[PDB]
Amino acid sequence: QVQLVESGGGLVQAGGSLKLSCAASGFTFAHYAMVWFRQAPGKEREFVAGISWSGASTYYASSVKGRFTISRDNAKNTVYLQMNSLKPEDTAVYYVAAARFGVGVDDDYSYWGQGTQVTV
Amino acid sequence: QVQLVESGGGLVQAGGSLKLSCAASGFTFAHYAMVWFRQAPGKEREFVAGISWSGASTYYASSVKGRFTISRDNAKNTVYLQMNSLKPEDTAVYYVAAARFGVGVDDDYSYWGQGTQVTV
Amino acid sequence: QVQLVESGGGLVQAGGSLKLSCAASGFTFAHYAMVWFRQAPGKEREFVAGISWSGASTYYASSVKGRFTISRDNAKNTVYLQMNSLKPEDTAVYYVAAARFGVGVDDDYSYWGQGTQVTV
Amino acid sequence: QVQLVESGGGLVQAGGSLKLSCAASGFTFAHYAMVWFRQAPGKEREFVAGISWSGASTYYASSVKGRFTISRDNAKNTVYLQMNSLKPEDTAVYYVAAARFGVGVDDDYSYWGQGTQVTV
Amino acid sequence: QVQLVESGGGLVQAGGSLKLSCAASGFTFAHYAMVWFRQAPGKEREFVAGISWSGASTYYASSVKGRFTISRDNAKNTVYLQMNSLKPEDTAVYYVAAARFGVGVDDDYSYWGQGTQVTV
Amino acid sequence: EFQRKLYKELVKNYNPLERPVANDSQPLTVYFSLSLLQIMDVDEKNQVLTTNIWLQMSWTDHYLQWNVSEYPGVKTVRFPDGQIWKPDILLYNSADERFDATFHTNVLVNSSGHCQYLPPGIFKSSCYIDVRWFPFDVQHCKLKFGSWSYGGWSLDLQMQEADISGYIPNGEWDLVGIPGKRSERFYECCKEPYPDVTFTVTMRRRT
Amino acid sequence: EFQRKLYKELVKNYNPLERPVANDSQPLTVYFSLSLLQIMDVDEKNQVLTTNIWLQMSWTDHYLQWNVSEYPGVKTVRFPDGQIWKPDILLYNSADERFDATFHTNVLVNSSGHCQYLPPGIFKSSCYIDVRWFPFDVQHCKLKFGSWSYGGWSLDLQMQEADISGYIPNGEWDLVGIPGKRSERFYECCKEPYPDVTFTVTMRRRT
Amino acid sequence: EFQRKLYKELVKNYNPLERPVANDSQPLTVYFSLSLLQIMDVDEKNQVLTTNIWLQMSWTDHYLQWNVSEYPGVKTVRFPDGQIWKPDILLYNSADERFDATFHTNVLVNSSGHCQYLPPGIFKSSCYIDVRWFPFDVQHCKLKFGSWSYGGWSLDLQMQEADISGYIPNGEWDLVGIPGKRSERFYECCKEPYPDVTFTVTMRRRT
Amino acid sequence: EFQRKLYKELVKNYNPLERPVANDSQPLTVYFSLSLLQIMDVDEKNQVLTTNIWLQMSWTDHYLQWNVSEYPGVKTVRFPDGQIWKPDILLYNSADERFDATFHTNVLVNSSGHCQYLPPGIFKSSCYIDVRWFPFDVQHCKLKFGSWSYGGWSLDLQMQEADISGYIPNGEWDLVGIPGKRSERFYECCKEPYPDVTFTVTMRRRT
Amino acid sequence: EFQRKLYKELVKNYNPLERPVANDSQPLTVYFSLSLLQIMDVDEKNQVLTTNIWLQMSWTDHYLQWNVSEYPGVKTVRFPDGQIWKPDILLYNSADERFDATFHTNVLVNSSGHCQYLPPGIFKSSCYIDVRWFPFDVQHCKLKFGSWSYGGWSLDLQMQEADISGYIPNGEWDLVGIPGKRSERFYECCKEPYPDVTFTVTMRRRT
Ligand SMILES: *[C@@H]1O[C@H](CO)[C@@H](O[C@@H]2O[C@H](CO)[C@@H](O)[C@H](O)[C@H]2NC(C)=O)[C@H](O)[C@H]1NC(C)=O
Ligand SMILES: *[C@@H]1O[C@H](CO)[C@@H](O[C@@H]2O[C@H](CO)[C@@H](O)[C@H](O)[C@H]2NC(C)=O)[C@H](O)[C@H]1NC(C)=O
Ligand SMILES: *[C@@H]1O[C@H](CO)[C@@H](O[C@@H]2O[C@H](CO)[C@@H](O)[C@H](O)[C@H]2NC(C)=O)[C@H](O)[C@H]1NC(C)=O
Ligand SMILES: *[C@@H]1O[C@H](CO)[C@@H](O[C@@H]2O[C@H](CO)[C@@H](O)[C@H](O)[C@H]2NC(C)=O)[C@H](O)[C@H]1NC(C)=O
Ligand SMILES: *[C@@H]1O[C@H](CO)[C@@H](O[C@@H]2O[C@H](CO)[C@@H](O)[C@H](O)[C@H]2NC(C)=O)[C@H](O)[C@H]1NC(C)=O
Ligand SMILES: *[C@@H]1O[C@H](CO)[C@@H](O)[C@H](O)[C@H]1NC(C)=O
Ligand SMILES: *[C@@H]1O[C@H](CO)[C@@H](O)[C@H](O)[C@H]1NC(C)=O
Ligand SMILES: *[C@@H]1O[C@H](CO)[C@@H](O)[C@H](O)[C@H]1NC(C)=O
Ligand SMILES: *[C@@H]1O[C@H](CO)[C@@H](O)[C@H](O)[C@H]1NC(C)=O
Ligand SMILES: *[C@@H]1O[C@H](CO)[C@@H](O)[C@H](O)[C@H]1NC(C)=O
Ligand SMILES: *[C@@H]1O[C@H](CO)[C@@H](O)[C@H](O)[C@H]1NC(C)=O
Ligand SMILES: *[C@@H]1O[C@H](CO)[C@@H](O)[C@H](O)[C@H]1NC(C)=O
Ligand SMILES: *[C@@H]1O[C@H](CO)[C@@H](O)[C@H](O)[C@H]1NC(C)=O
Ligand SMILES: *[C@@H]1O[C@H](CO)[C@@H](O)[C@H](O)[C@H]1NC(C)=O
Ligand SMILES: *[C@@H]1O[C@H](CO)[C@@H](O)[C@H](O)[C@H]1NC(C)=O
């Protein structure tokens, strides 16, 4: 019963803060690198953040580095995206992908979440 | 004469229930894993539900688990999708794909159905 | 000078009949499986009908079986699509593809026609 | 400095004539098969004409054969598309592709031109 | 912390000049060929300029050669695009891609930048 | 045509690495039997027996079933080595430098998915040579076959009597016989059986 | 060019695993004939015959036809091993350690789809050696060829007379001849014929 | 099914070229032990020892772990050569023309990722033959095994006692024993250890 | 860089199965010449000649041309076996068990597309041994080379004189010479020539 | 992890066919040196020398550089044969039937891109045997190594002294020595040098 449930989305003003949280179930969370993708309404998916399976490597998109912070908690099987100073182009459905022992940037993902809409 | 005929679609209100049924012909139904895909009007196809060829494994999308229930009847060569508490984003053409001895999630499908439109 | 010329399209009312005919030239017609694809205006191409290179196997889409009938005449190098009881969703440009010794359903096509618009 | 410069486009009435010419530079023109593709505004690219690297084989699309004539001049490194009796659907940006020793129909192209807009 | 930061975009009139500059970090700049891609709003990405990893080979699109000039500075880890006599179709988000020891035209890129919008 | 359709469809979702069983918790039954063609050499200094043997392994691929009515004229199918799963039945006491003298032929599958595999080979097997009744010695050379990596409950190896209908008599050794025996061996860690089939060729020195 | 077009088109929809027949319910006719080049060795202790043989298999690929007018200058085509279907004709009574001494050369196909296959080889075959007329013995060594997995009604194996025009005489054995015979063998389960071609080389000991 | 799912998932992001360690700064422990089956030849002119040996290498693939509950009935998995990482343990003093007499069998991995590799082989090793106590000579033939390209701190090679339970006695040499010893050798450039395992077979000439 | 660009571009549209000719109706000229290095063995019982030979085949690939100015520093290119078209020149009267003793080296192509191929080999060829002037016999061993599947009008095989500059004298046979001759042989069905090059090594027995 | 990232990134744009040089107009320096392990056979009838040799080729791949800080714990990388460019250094005067006795091991590359290649082999080389001082003869057997297709200005072959630290003494021949010499040979068409390294093993017959 592999499931990736995202939460914490909604409406924010510019220069705000939001803590997106995704809970994983049905698979070994510590064995998978967990990354955040975004889908803007009429564009294509793009990488936002990614953390390695060991949690020792975090990779952020150039458009978001310094503002977004990806983290993981293996005890609660959770992936956190702490976003600070959001901006109008940070408006999309954010959803989480999981890759088996992935590095965190270029990986073949196995499980995909539903996603939460955030609007700026 | 491989054919996958879907039926049971139509108009429903939110928090309703619908039993979609797909009948298969022209191929050994018990040898194929049967999955449900949906096509929203201006988006891409996405997995909704899937049952293994043996019927011992059911996989649901994170957006729909708990509400939708996939089942199969090999005697009547039928795949059932029992949907409870539908929601406005559950509005699409639902069509059934068949994969030879597939697991039920990631498979190379061989036969595709026409599809029934459901609107919430 | 491989050419696939389709003809017989136009405007029809619902529950009508149309005989689309495609003439082939420049290649051995008896060595190729000949299939009909359709392109609705703002959607993707999809299979409608297909006949094997030997003409002993006809495959129809589930949305059209019983109403459409594909046939071939090797003497005149012609592929016929006899459509009965057309329906509003049978409105598209219909064009013919040729696959070398193809089965008639899943094949790598070599030659493509121009297409005739039919509207219901 | 591989460059493919197209010229000769513009506005024409139906049943007219236009001579599109593409000049090539930066590569051995006699070693490449030179083909014409078109891009209509809201559709996909499609093959219009093609000449082999030796110039002994010309392939035209079924929609355009008899009306368009592809030719090549290796002395001036030029590809000519002589269009007669243009039609409203012959409205697109026409651009030239080059394939190394290509046959002229199905080839892996290496160099692409900019393109000239023609409107009917 | 691989990052490609583009800067120098904005609003320009026709027949103007703009010097786009992209700074690279987190990877060996001298080991990567650095190219400029553009994304017009409702079209696909396309190559504009490219410089080899050694800086001894510059490749420009046929639509832009003579007007745009790509250069690189390995001491400052910077890629420069000097654009002269811009034109209305030179309106897009310009972003930089990096390919490991790439030639500069056809390469598998590893790192992508964010991009700067220029309008003519 | 129908053969083309069947060949395209049979490999839709097929992993050669996976045991072709409907249920993963029960073993696949593999029937094993050899055919002796001739005893080529009995090396006494290096305790090695060289024989011509045609192996025969029969199993059931649950994934290679099809309808004869839906595929007229195609009641059988051939798959080369490496495209479908095959049992890893090897000669344990083999003294060949390559350790695998089998020539990998095509596996034949019929409509019910029954797979037949007939590898010919010139097998060099380790056989203790007892020379103390030298002019009238009878020697029992064991040919021990088994799955290299599968045990019981996964690959149930069953035995069929070897046939000597194609045997070519040797000018030095007389084939008294070749009876087969199926044995099960157990680890200390688990109660998992490990089956094997030993064909004990009995030869008499010709005087 | 036209050869490039033909090579690209011929493999559009081609499965090497499928028998190249228009109708799957009738056999493909394969004509088989060997060419003896020289008898290299007649081993008497190990009953093995070593010979140089060029096989010749001719069949018809229904999928490799093209128009010479549409492809000027290209009236023939070559396909390496593994890219097109080839008959699995093997020497049944072969005593070679690899069991297949054939060197897989390219298959030659002409405009009508006729495929020619000429594998050279140094064949080691099992031959019972009778030594009781030792100074004047005539020996009949059988070379038995057949399809390993195809039977009748699928692969109709036909025989052509072997040619000894390139034969190199041996210093110990005189080639009395090499007549071929086509035989059909039947299972009990089915009425399906199984054809084979046996070339019986007749040799006389040279005194 | 579950085996199909596991086989598809285990190779999602897998590079056979990469050492299967969670942390790249610590070595992977590989346990090595050989099984002597028989001493086939002791060549005295060419100082070469020919023996039948089954190697046994056990390590831990961090990338081949799975949940038995999530994959019922699938507690083990097999991977052929070239699809997963294997230690490059070779016989350094090997006199074989191919230098690698091992037959590459499948690697067996269980739910915790523990990989077992059992290559059989007929090993030809360089052994100095001392013939000065000719009728009563005892010879120490060294079989030196080690990683060809990995050193210490990357591939920690550990030794397990060799077993002679399947040994077949030789008619000319008596196996006094086969003790193993793990040694570490150092470069001048770095303090990086290089481990190796030498099994010194002790044989006595039989009189 | 320029070499990377050239290697990527040269294989854009390239089929190794296609003869590299601009016009398909005219033959490709292949120049053939061998280099004798040493005569290793002259087998008299089995009429076989064993020699060390370096073949040299030169042709022109019309598809492997490039501009040195456009690719500075890259005036030559190497292609391994199987990536570009090579002539199927084989030794017809070869008695080797593999029938092809050539070691497939890389083909060297320069800016004009000229391809050079230098396969070394230890060739075992069928040679009738005449022993009736035994102490003073001169033997003519023919090495017959030709295209296996191409004939005239497709592969024009031309001859170049063999060089013995690297010849190593033999202790039993004196190399009188090795002249080459190009011959054309014709079928009855067509007027299509079939060229071949025969190098007739002339040896004298050393007394 | 970092090793996975490095292995994925190193093959982003990599062609094994291309010489790994930053500038295509200057040669890549390849350092060559052999290690003699033992002289196995000195064949006098067939003028062939059989020896155990470990080659050592060191070069610099400009494309296999990485940052140790960016890839912590990964200071080295292994690439199998066929995935990265390797020098085509072969033994010119080799009498082996395969002509290449090297066992293709993995190439080891460190952070600066320095590639080390250590192929073991049992080399059969052509050596003129002079037997006229038979009881006290000293023989100079030349082992000539060079690039098969690269010349000077592309592959600069440099020599390093051979080491005999692992030499195993022979019972018939005493190793007087093995000095190496680098020579350059020139064509008439061009001034392009062609380097080669000849190691002349000097042996004395043991009395
Ligand atoms: C396909 O092959 C199988 C196996 O030969 C046939 O099924 C039976 O299999 C058992 C053993 O598994 C044999 O003992 C029987 O003799 C087989 N029945 C026969 C030969 O009639 C099966 O009949 C074959 N044909 C089809 C269409 O499945
Ligand atoms: C192509 O090859 C075939 C076979 O060699 C030729 O067709 C005939 O085939 C039969 C046997 O199948 C032979 O007995 C005839 O002699 C062949 N006719 C000939 C050689 O004229 C065919 O002619 C060849 N050429 C073409 C263009 O198909
Ligand atoms: C999988 O295999 C491993 C290794 O055999 C088992 O784990 C233990 O491993 C150590 C050495 O690494 C052995 O000494 C122990 O005896 C092993 N424990 C046992 C055999 O109980 C592991 O138990 C096996 N099974 C699973 C589910 O991981
Ligand atoms: C490339 O190689 C060819 C062939 O060696 C050179 O062209 C001439 O080829 C003929 C035979 O085809 C030889 O007889 C000539 O000697 C060659 N001319 C020379 C060696 O100058 C060609 O010159 C080489 N170089 C280039 C740049 O094409
Ligand atoms: C990587 O390997 C190279 C080569 O061994 C080291 O660089 C020097 O290389 C020259 C020859 O190219 C040697 O003579 C030196 O001894 C090498 N320096 C050493 C060993 O310190 C290099 O140091 C190695 N390590 C790194 C990180 O590049
Ligand atoms: C498989 O076998 C197990 C045990 O024999 C049984 O419990 C299960 O129901 C079977 N079927 C499955 C897992 O689909
Ligand atoms: C498929 O097989 C079933 C039973 O095996 C049979 O009833 C059915 O008719 C077959 N399909 C066709 C198209 O005949
Ligand atoms: C194939 O042969 C069968 C039997 O001879 C025949 O009934 C059929 O019409 C043929 N053609 C096909 C199956 O297309
Ligand atoms: C193709 O072949 C047919 C008959 O075999 C012939 O009539 C036709 O002219 C050929 N095609 C061309 C383009 O000539
Ligand atoms: C890996 O090991 C190093 C040194 O032992 C240690 O510093 C580091 O924290 C470990 N974990 C990593 C790199 O994730
Ligand atoms: C996966 O394993 C954990 C512990 O190893 C266990 O608690 C969990 O129940 C397993 N998953 C399932 C679906 O049972
Ligand atoms: C090829 O050769 C033929 C005959 O020699 C000639 O007629 C033709 O013009 C040449 N060129 C082509 C086919 O492009
Ligand atoms: C390409 O070659 C031609 C003649 O071979 C030469 O004139 C031209 O300058 C070359 N290209 C370049 C870029 O120099
Ligand atoms: C490469 O070498 C040539 C000659 O040594 C030199 O002219 C050139 O500047 C170098 N660098 C390049 C081509 O990038
Ligand atoms: C990469 O290497 C350079 C010098 O080799 C060094 O200054 C830099 O710190 C390294 N990168 C990182 C992330 O440390």
Numbering used by the authors:
A (entry chain H), B (entry chain G), C (entry chain F), D (entry chain J), E (entry chain I): 2 to 121
F (entry chain B), G (entry chain A), H (entry chain C), I (entry chain E), J (entry chain D): 1 to 207
What wording appears in the published article?
To develop a novel class of α7 ligands, we recently generated two nanobodies named E3 and C4, acting as positive allosteric modulator and silent allosteric ligand, respectively. E3 and C4 bind to a common epitope involving two subunits at the apex of the receptor.
We solved the cryo-EM structure of the α7∆ICDcryo in the presence of a 50-fold excess of C4 (1 µM α7 pentamer for 50 µM C4, C4-Apo structure). For the ECD and nanobodies, the density map is of good quality and allows to confidently build the main and side chains of the protein with a nominal resolution of 2.3 Å. In contrast, the density of the TMD and associated lipid nanodisc, although visible at low contouring of the map, shows poor quality with no elongated and rod-like feature that could be attributed to transmembrane helices. Those markers indicate that the C4-Apo structure shows an apo-like conformation of α7 ECD. C4 adopts a classical immunoglobulin-like fold, despite lacking the canonical intra-sandwich disulfide bond.
